[PDB]
Subunit: 193 residues, 4 copies
């Protein structure tokens, strides 16, 4: 049952005519053995967004080994830059995933360490509005208390009579799932041996 | 016999004035010993497309090793991201090629495995219309039954009286060619020894 | 105390309504044991800049090992191209940092060698103006006498009653800090052993 | 003597107000021991070009090891994609250089082999016009007889009374220079031992 028709029209949202929401929370949990920070990003019901892309910054004041204090310092969280998976094809809500690896700022952050960290994730979508011919930027924010450790996003997408429908009342909904409380670094150590 | 004149005008489509089609099917076959998924993408007879680029997504529901079910999950099929061969110079139909390697989702997919897979390839061209000064997105789709294994695209381009002409009646046409029925992974294994 | 609200509005510049300055000087100094060339770049008080990015060129006449003289030759100074840290989220002044490594043109340049070099750094920001829907380019320049060796930028950002304020009278201000007078290459050599 | 003023205005073309030409020929010759294909690209006297970038394609019909004939097949010639040196700061004519290495299509092409090759280089600049707020594409072409082996571009840039002037009558001019007649591959072989 096709997601996209041969002519490029999408079988989503029966009877559409082709403000953008981010999930209120972010989740952390395992996917294929890798620990992932994930948040959700909705489509615009009534228009495509050409050249869509997602990026995320980490706002976190820091001190260099030489004592320079950098308030609200920015660093770029990896959400598919290298493989071009940041280039979105937004035609229904997507879970964006940041794999927490050796280069990720969350490498050394455990379930317990987490609420003691003072940091904020800024998510930024940017694209051109299909109809409007204009460049949009949509932004949102997550702080330490809004990253739910050990959770996943409820799915929202069902197939009904040859179109795909979105239950937007589940958009922000998440559920709990068995998930180690160790930091990614620790997990790596433990696993390797 | 020049494809492009010193002043930048192209010797294609005698008497042009400078809707975009994708081939109805995709083909898989060997090119220089590498197995390739290929589809074709036409130009617009009557205008250049500045900053053209092609990308492709794989729509395929999946289950993580932790049992999270991701319906119609997206992953980015490599069509020249790294070398900038995705940056198209569209002035006649082009065969876009995805080399099926260790990173490709088709790595483990044989001729027989193929029709049993439930997946869909979304192709998306994007550029600015030379004349119209506006950002376009053109899309199309291939499902398992529309990828012809062991085929190639008929050529369409002939040189006639100092211009190059396109036989658009061959645009979607393909022909059969000797092609192993083994998956790319298998071919690799076999070859290496 | 949030930098960005859940709805994407920023808590910066109480009572704003959402010309761009570069710092007059550049500084060189250690950050986390790496030697860095840094300059500062302000926001526009009264509008966001979508798709912001920074690049920098090195203007420096040179002679090839074959005696070709290239006047005012250009080479690209690395300011976060690879990790996408050049993709700015400009909502207050940012210190842009170029880590002076083996690929950097300053690799072999010491504190003493510096004023004897005849070179110029061109910095170029580019983005779309949130409101104006138009592509802007802002440029500035640093010459040998405008790179202060052994300095850092004064911070400018303070938190006041739930908004963040910018002391623009400190924008261009810098202070001295203990910093080795050896070139990056030399430091590397010395350290490694 | 500044190339760019602190406020971002350029000291080029006294009394300007801020059609684009490519050199008629391309040259091949050594730069710092590496063999380089080079062509020249002028600025627009009377406007900046924001977000400028250069790419080049190789048009060359080919036959795969499986006998598929691909007429006027395209492949992307590397002109600074990886280091972002393709991102031009066009404010006077620039020599664009493609280093002929193991990945370059000219790797195996000698001075003698050259005129027997049937190939064409398409060069494409793209950017937004500073004033006009519009996306431009400028194109040109080089065929085998227009790549002068063993040459260099005459310089065109002189400094006069605090502005830099361009002698546009030298734009297309080139001069001969001692240059080995061996292919890049061959040179590599020879040198390594
Ligand atoms: Cs990238
Ligand atoms: Cs974008
Ligand atoms: Cs890329
Ligand atoms: Cs594009
Ligand atoms: Cs990049
Ligand atoms: Cs940009
Ligand atoms: Cs790139
Ligand atoms: Cs561009
Ligand atoms: Mg653009």
């Amino acid at each position: 049952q096709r997601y996209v028709r041969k002519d490029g029209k999408c079988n989503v949202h029966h009877g559409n005519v082709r403000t953008l929401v981010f999930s209120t929370h972010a989740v952390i949990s395992m996917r294929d053995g890798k620990l992932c920070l994930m948040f959700r990003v909705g489509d615009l019901r009534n228009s495509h967004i050409v050249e869509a892309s997602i990026r995320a910054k980490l706002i976190k004041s820091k001190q260099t080994s030489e004592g320079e204090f950098i308030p609200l310092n920015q660093t770029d969280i990896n959400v598919g830059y290298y493989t071009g998976d940041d280039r979105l094809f937004l035609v229904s809500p997507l879970i964006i995933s940041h794999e927490i690896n050796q280069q990720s700022p969350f490498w050394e952050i455990s379930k317990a360490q987490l609420p003691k960290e003072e940091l904020e994730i800024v998510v930024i979508l940017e694209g051109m509005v299909e109809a409007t011919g204009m460049t949009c930027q949509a932004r949102s924010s997550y702080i330490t208390s809004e990253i739910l450790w050990g959770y996943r996003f409820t799915p929202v997408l069902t197939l009904e009579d040859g179109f795909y429908e979105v239950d937007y009342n589940s958009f922000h909904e998440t559920y709990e799932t068995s998930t180690p409380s160790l930091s990614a670094k620790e997990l790596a150590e433990l696993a390797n041996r």
